[PDB]
Structure 1
């Protein structure tokens, strides 16, 4: 579901039940250095003024950047979790899709850093989100 990296035999929460399944995030491409994902805008993505919620751009960036890290480190016995997210909002999105492209810009032993651009259907850059992903050894 959502085409998230398949790194474990089971997961605590089914895709369709998570925030990500609820709003409809879907991953398209995914490599160690770059990953893309998108979502259809519907009310569930919007806030009361009719624009895509700022939290939705943060949430798509976070899932994409974290899972793109999980895709690499999980089989190395590590876990990956968001430690910091900085999002800037340049243009509202009223409808259509949001498309996210994540580029890896640093991969340290304790911290990976991704830049995520969020664009509307015309290709305009509506938001960007910088994420720092902590990598730590798994607890079992």
Structure 2
């Protein structure tokens, strides 16, 4: 079932990243279903931590990016959304290729929402589990 209130295309979605942290990290929206939003991010110099692994901060940023956008797509003209609470558990390390974030809703209220964001490595293994709470300012 389609849940989105705002109907946009991937090209339009990616156009919002221009000149923001999203583009600075190479995050690209890659899939938009009826009730799910996906984006991929590279594991290189821009998202690395000392030893060469994926920085725990990059995964967090990817999650915050997806939850905010999905939340936005659930609002109507004149409304706005803002990320209020974030938590994340780092299960496994990643050192090469790209990771893929999958965002799905857990609760959709008219005043606030809760989104799940699981991050997988190119082998399909879950490397990070996050949850983001948002507030609608509409």
Q: What's the TM-score bracket when you normalise by the shorter of the two chains?
A: 0.7 to 0.9
Q: Which runs of 5+ in 2 are unaligned?
A: 1-9
Equivalent residues in 2 for 1:1-140 (5 A)? Answer: 3=11, 5=13, 15-31=17-33, 33-73=35-75, 75-137=76-138
- Structure 1 residue 15: Cα displacement: 2.9
In angstroms, what is the RMSD of aligned CA positions? 2.0
Give the SS at the match of 2:137.
Answer: strand
Within 1, Cα distance between the matches of 2:33 and 2:135? 18
Q: Which runs of 5+ in 1 are unaligned?
A: none
Within 2, Cα distance between the matches of 1:135 and 1:32? 21
Task: Return the TM-score normalized by structure 2.
Answer: 0.85
Question: Which structure has greater helix proportion?
Answer: 1
Using a 3 Å threshold, how does the CA distance of structure 1 residues 4 and 49 change in structure 2: closer, same or farther? farther
Task: Return the TM-score normalized by structure 1.
Answer: 0.84
